[PDB]
Symmetry: D2
Subunit: 434 residues, 4 copies
Amino acid sequence: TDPIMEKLNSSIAYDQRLSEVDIQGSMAYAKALEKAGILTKTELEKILSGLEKISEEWSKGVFVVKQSDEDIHTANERRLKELIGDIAGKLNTGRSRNDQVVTDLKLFMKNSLSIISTHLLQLIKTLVERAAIEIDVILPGYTNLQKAQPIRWSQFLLSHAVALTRDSERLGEVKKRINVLPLGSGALAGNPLDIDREMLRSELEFASISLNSMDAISERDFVVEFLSFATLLMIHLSKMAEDLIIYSTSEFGFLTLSDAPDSLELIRSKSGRVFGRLASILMVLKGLPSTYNKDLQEDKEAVFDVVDTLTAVLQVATGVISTLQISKENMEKALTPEMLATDLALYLVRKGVPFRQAHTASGKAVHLAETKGITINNLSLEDLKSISPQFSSDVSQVFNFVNSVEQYTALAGTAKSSVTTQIEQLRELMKKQK
Amino acid sequence: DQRLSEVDIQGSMAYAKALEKAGILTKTELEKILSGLEKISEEWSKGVFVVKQSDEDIHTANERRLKELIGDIAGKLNTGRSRNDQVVTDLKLFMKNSLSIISTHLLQLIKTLVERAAIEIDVILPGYTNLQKAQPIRWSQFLLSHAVALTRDSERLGEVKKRINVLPLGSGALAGNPLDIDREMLRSELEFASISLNSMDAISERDFVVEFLSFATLLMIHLSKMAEDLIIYSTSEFGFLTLSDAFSTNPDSLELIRSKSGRVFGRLASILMVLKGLPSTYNKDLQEDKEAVFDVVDTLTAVLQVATGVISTLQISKENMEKALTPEMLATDLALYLVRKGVPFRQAHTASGKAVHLAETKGITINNLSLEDLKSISPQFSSDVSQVFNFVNSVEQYTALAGTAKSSVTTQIEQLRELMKKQK
Amino acid sequence: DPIMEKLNSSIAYDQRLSEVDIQGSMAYAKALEKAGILTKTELEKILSGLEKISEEDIHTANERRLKELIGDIAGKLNTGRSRNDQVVTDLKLFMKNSLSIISTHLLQLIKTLVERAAIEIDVILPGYTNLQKAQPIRWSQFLLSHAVALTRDSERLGEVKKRINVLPLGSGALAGNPLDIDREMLRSELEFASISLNSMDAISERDFVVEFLSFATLLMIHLSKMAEDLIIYSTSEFGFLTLSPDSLELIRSKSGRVFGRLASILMVLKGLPSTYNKDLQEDKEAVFDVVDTLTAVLQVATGVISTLQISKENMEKALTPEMLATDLALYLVRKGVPFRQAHTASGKAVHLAETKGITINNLSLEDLKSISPQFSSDVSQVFNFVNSVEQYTALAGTAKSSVTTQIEQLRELMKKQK
Amino acid sequence: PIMEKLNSSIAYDQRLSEVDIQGSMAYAKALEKAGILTKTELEKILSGLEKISEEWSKGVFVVKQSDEDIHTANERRLKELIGDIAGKLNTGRSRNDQVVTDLKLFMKNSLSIISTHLLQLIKTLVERAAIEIDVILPGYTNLQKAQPIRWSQFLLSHAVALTRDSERLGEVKKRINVLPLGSGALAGNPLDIDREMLRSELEFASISLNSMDAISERDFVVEFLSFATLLMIHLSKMAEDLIIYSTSEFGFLTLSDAFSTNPDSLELIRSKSGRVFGRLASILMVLKGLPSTYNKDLQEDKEAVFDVVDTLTAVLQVATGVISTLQISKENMEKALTPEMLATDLALYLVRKGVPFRQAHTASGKAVHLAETKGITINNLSLEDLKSISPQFSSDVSQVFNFVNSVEQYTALAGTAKSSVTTQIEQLRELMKKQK
Ligand SMILES: N/C(=N\CCCC(N)C(=O)O)N[C@@H](CC(=O)O)C(=O)O
C-alpha cells in the first residue's frame, strides 16, 4: 500500500556485488541438502548446473533484473526458478535469510579484506623501500609545528610505516573472526534439519563454525571491528596527508607531488567519511533486543562504502609516496644552529655536567648570540670556556647536524644504524604478515 | 594525585638503573635514589603527599619531591629523558594493569553465564524476532549467545593488551634517546614484552588508546543488549524474571549498564577527533587522552561487576516462561514434520497454512485438531504428528552445531569452558 | 588513472543539482549582462540554451551541453565566477527546497498525532518509568508528548532554513567577485532573503550542513523513541495495539544512519585551515542521503500513527490497583496527614494486602483504619482510574482539561510553524 | 557497594545545590498557596532553605555518606534544622521534574556567561580588523597561496562564523527558558500546584506543555552540545590557521609569552573540539532507543553539560586573549605577496576591455609563459612583450602589478576591498547590539 516502504527495503540497487557469494552459498547448501536426504543426487545436479549458469551470466553482465526483484537473494532464486523448474523451491528448505545474509557478508568481507591487505602492505613496502634509498636526507623534526631537532627524512617515512604495520596486524585479527561459518544457524534456533555444517565450512572454505545460532544471527561485531580497523587506518593516512600538505607548501618547500587532482586532500577527507560509518553502525546496534531485527539491514551500505574507500585511498597513497619529489637542499636549508641548542647541553652532560646544571649554559649562549648577533656556533673558547669549564676544542663537533642525528643510536633512534635496523625489522614484519 | 604515580615512580627507578649503566650515575647515587623513590611509593600506599600548586602534572609532584628527600642530585634523573616518552610509558603501564583487572571481571561474568546455563539447561521460553514470539528456545541458548559475544571481547582485549605491552620509554622528545640508553634494560625492569620500533611513532601515536576505547565500545554494545533483554523480560507484561533487589531501586542496575554505552562511545569519538587532524610529531592536543582512559577503565570495572551480580542473583519464573509457549509457535515445526517425509518445501508450509486456518476458522488451536482434520489437508500426516505439539521436541530438532537442542547446548558449554581456560 | 579521478567523479549522484545549477547560471548571466561583460544579444544566447537544458560533474555536464548548443559564446559565463561559490549556491538552493518538503511532511505527522489525541481522549493506560507501571495516564497524553517534541524539531527546522536562505553566490574563489557584480540582483533572481557577509566565510563554511544534520539527528532520536514505544506496546505481551513490513524497526534503524552523517561531516570539518579545501566535497552525499531518509521516514511514521489499531480493552485491563498506591497516599495528604505519614500509611496498606493475598482495593474499611483512622469510607473513590487521571488538572498534566488545552496550544503552533 | 557507588550522583550534581534550593523555595511557596503548608510552616521552611543556601556558599555544608544525590542531602539538612516540618516539602513533587528544573536553571545561567565571553571574542576580532585594515597577506586554497586579501577580511571571516554561533546560542537559550517543574513523576502535579506562580518565582519565560515530554526529553541538552560542537569547529579552524601562520616557515605572526607556552594555547583550543564532540555523541547515543517516559539512563546528562560549560568558558577567554595580544609581522605577510598571484588579475585586465573570458586567460597564461622562458616575473615583461600577446594591453597594465589595487577590485558586497571591509564591520557591529 505504501510505495515508500517497498523502496526502503529495496537493496538490489546497491546489493548485487554479492551475487557470487550468494550463489556459492546455495551450491554449498544444496550439496549438504542432498546428504541431509532432502535432495536426490539427480536434483542436486540440476540445481548446481542451474546455479553454475546464472553464475556465468553475471560475469558478463548478461544477467537481467526484473522490477520485482527486491534484492539479490530473490533475483537469483527467481532466475533459478525460471531455469530448472519448480524443483527450485527445495533449496530454501530449512534455511533463512537471517543466516544467509550474514553468510553473504562475511564471505564478501573476507574476499575484500584480502584485496585491502595487499594494497596496505604495498603502501608500507613503498614507505620502507623509500626510507632505504634516502636514508641520508636530513630535515627538521617538529613539536607543535615548531622546528624541534634534526632527524633523518627516513626516520619520518618509517614512523608512518610502523603505525601502518599495526593496522595490517589488526586487519588480520579481524579477518580471523570473520572467517567463521554462520550458515546453518537458520532463522534463530539453528538449522532444523540436522544439516552438515562441517560440510558447509569445507565447501565455503571458512576456518570454523559459529558456536551459537542466536549470536551468529544477531551480532555485527565483524562489521564494527572492520569499521574501527578502517577508521584507525584513516587516522594514520590523514596524519601523513597533513604532514605532506604542510611540507608541500611554498613556505615549507620541502617537496612536490607528481600529476599534471588534490590527492592529499581526498585522503584527509575520507577519514570523516569512514568515521561516519562506524558511528552509524554503533548506534543502529545500541539497544536492540535479541535476536534478529530489521535494523541489522543497515550494515551493507556501510561495509560497501568503506570497502571501496580504503581500496581507492590506499592505492592513491602508494602513488603519492612513490612519485613525490623532495628537495634535499631545502630540507637541509631548514636546519639551523639554534636546533643544536639541545645537543649543546648534551656536550656538558657527557663531560660530567649534570642535567639542569648543563641546560643553563645552553640558554646563556643563546641569549648571548641574541646579544652578539650570531649563531651559537660562531662563538669561541675565548668566551664559552667562561660559561663553563667544559668546552675543549672538541665541542666544535657539536655544531654538525650529521653528528647531531648520529647521537640517536639507541633502538628506535634516528641514527643511520637505528634506522637500518628498523628497515630490517619492517621487512620481517611484512615477510610474516604474509 | 593518585594513579599515574606508582607507575611513574617505577618509571624513574628503571631509567635510573639504566642511567647508572650509562655513566651518568654511580652506585652511591643510584642507591640514594632507588631508595628515595621507594620511599615515595612508601608514602602513597599510606596517604601522604599532596602539596603546593606550581607542580603541574603529577610528574613534577614527584620530581620536585626528590629535591626534598635527597637533593639537587635528583636533577640527573631526567638526563636525556623527555616528558613525551615519559607520559606514554606511564599510560601503557597503567592500562596494562587495568586491562588485567578488567579481564578478570570479564571472565567472571562469562563464567557466571556459562555456569548458570548448565544448571537451567532444561528451561524453555520464546525466542524473539523483531520482538514477536517466533519459536521455542532453551533459556540457556539465550544466556550462551551473550557469553559467546563476550568471549570475543576477551579475545580483542588480549589483542589490545599485547600492543600496549611495548616499551616506548627511551624515545625521548621525538628523535630518540641521546645517551644511547639501554632500552632492553628498561624493558626488563618495567617488564614489557618488546620495545618500540620508531621514536617518532612511539611519541605521537595513540593507537593503543583508540583500540582500548574501540574494544570497550563493542563490549558495552553487548552489555547494553543483554540489559535491554532483561529489562524487557523483567516487565510485568513479560513476567519472565525479577532482579534480586540489591541491583534494583525499578531495575536501575540494568538501566545503568545500558546508559554507560553512550558514555564510553563518547570517549571513543572524542579521541578519534583529537587525532584526526594532526601533523607529526608530538602535539599538546594528545593530552586529552588520559581522562578518557581513566573514565572508561572505571566504568568497565564497575559495570562488569554489576553485570555479574545481576546474572547470578536474578530469579526466573519457569512458570511464566513456559506459559508463554503457544501452539501458534509450532506452525513451522508442523511444516517441518512433512518435510522429513519427502514433502517439498512449498507444499509443506502450504499444508501447514491450511492447518492454522482450519483452526483459525474454528475455536481451537492447531494442537486440538484431530488426525481426521490434518488428513483433509495432507495424507502425509500420521498419528505421530501429535509429537509435534511438544515444546521439548520442538527444541530438540536443532541438533546441528550451534542449535538449541540439549546436546548442542552442552557442546557449547564445553567449548566456552575451553575458551575461558584459553583466556589465561 | 581512473583510481584517483574516479573519486572526484561527483556526477553519478548529484545530477539532482541540475535545475538549481541552471538557475544560478541564468541569474549570474543576467547580472553579468548588467555588468556589461555580456551584450544584450550574448544574453539571449546564454539563456535560451539554459532554457533547453532544464527542459531535459553536473557543472561540466551543463557547462558542456551549453557550448555545443549556442556555440563558443557560452564561454563568457564563467567570467568572474568560481566553482567554490557556485557549489555552495547549489547546495543552499537545493536544501531550501528540500526543507519545505520536509516541513510539510513533519507538519502532517504532528497533525495526525494531535488529531488522533482529540478523538481517543477517553482512553487510559499505564504510564511507564524504567518500563515499570508508574501511574495511570491518558493515551492522548502519550500521543501529545511526542507531538510536542516534534514541534520543537519544526522550530529548529525554521531556524536552520533561515541561515540557509542567504545568498553565497558572488564570493568568487575566496576574495569575492572581482567584477563588482550586483549581488542584490543575484539575490532577487534566485530568491534568497539576504546575501553573505564575508567571501572567505561563504566559500569555506558548512555550518548550514552541520545544522541541518543536527536537526535531522535529534528528529530521528524523537522518531526512534516513538517507534520503540510502539514496538513494545505492540508486542503480544503488552497487546496495547496492532499495526495495519517492520515499519517500526525501519524508522528506528534510520537514527544511526543519520547520526553517522552528522558525525562524518563534523569530522571532515575539524582542523581544516581557511579558506577552501577539497575535503569540503564530502558534504553532498551526506545531505542527499539525509534528505531522502527524512522524507521517507516521516511519511512512514504518519501512516503508522493514523492506521494503527489500539485495544481499549487491553489498555484498561493493564490498569492494576497497585498503580494507585500514590493516589492512596495522596488521599491522606488532602485530609491533612503529613507527606511522610501518608506515604508510609499507603506502604502498609500494600503490605497488609499482599499478606492476605488480595489487591489494595479489596481491603475492608476496617483493615485500613488499623493503618490510619484517617481512612474514611470515601477512600473508595480512590480506586477509580478516571479519578486517578482527573487529579492532574495543573497545566501540562494528564487530566482531560489539560489534554484539551494542549491540543489547542498545539493547533496554534502548527499554524505558526507554516 | 559498587552498585551504590555507580548509581550515586551526589559527587557531581553538587553544583546544583543553589538551583536546587531555589527550586524548593518556589515550590514551597506554591505549596503554601495550595494549602499543603501553613503560613508559619512556609516561613520556617523558607528560612531553613536560606540557611542551607549559605552553608554551600561559605563551603561549610557537610555531606554524609548516606547522601545519594544533592536532592537528598538538602532534604536531610532541612530536617535537622526545622525537624519534621521539612518533610512536607516534597508533597506532590518528584526527583524527575525536580532534576530537570535544576539542570535548566543551571544552564540558563551558564549560557548567559558563555554568551558574554563569545561576544567579547567577536568584539576583539572586529576591533582588531578595524585597526589593521591596511595589512595585506596571501589568501589560501588547499594551503597554496591563491589571491591576495586584507588581513582584516581574514579576521572578519572568523568573526562572522562566530556571530552565527551566538545566534544559535540565543535560540537554544529560549527553549531552555521553559519551566519543567510541576510535571511530577510523569503524569503532572496532583495537587493542582500553581505553575504560573512557579514560572514567576524561578523567572522562566513560559511553562512545560506536556508532563511526559517535560520529564523524558533532553533536547535542551543535545542542542547545547550541537551548539558547543559547531562553535568548537570554528575555534579549532581559527586555531589551525594561527598555528600554520605562527610557524617559522610562514612567520606571519607570533603569540605573546602569556599564551604561546610552541603556540600551546592554540593547540589547547584545537584539542577541545574533540572533547566537546565526544559529549555530543554520548548523550545522542544515550537517548537513542529509550522508551517513554523517565529512565535512569538520563542521569548521564549532567557530567556532559558541566564539562562542556566549563570547557567553552575557558576556551573562549583563551581565544580572546590570543587574538588581542598576538603580534603580526607586516613585513613578512607583505613579502609573502608575490607577482605570480596577480596572474589572474592580469587576465581580468583584458576582460575589462571586451576581451572574451576564453581568449582572456589564453592570453593571460601566455604572459606567464613568455616571462616563464626568461627567468623573471610577469611584472618585468616589457610593454612590447605584452602587446605581442594582445595589443589590447595598454600602458596602464603596470598598475595591475600592485597588491593594493589587487585587493580593491572586490568592491562587491562581501569582497576584501576596503569599502567592503568597513561595511562588514558596521554590519557585525549592528548584528551585535540587535543580538544583545
Ligand atoms: N523518582 C524516580 N527517579 C529519579 C532521579 C534523579 C537523578 N539522580 C537523575 O540524574 O536523573 N522515578 C520514579 C517515577 C514514578 O513513580 O512514576 C520511580 O522510581 O519509579
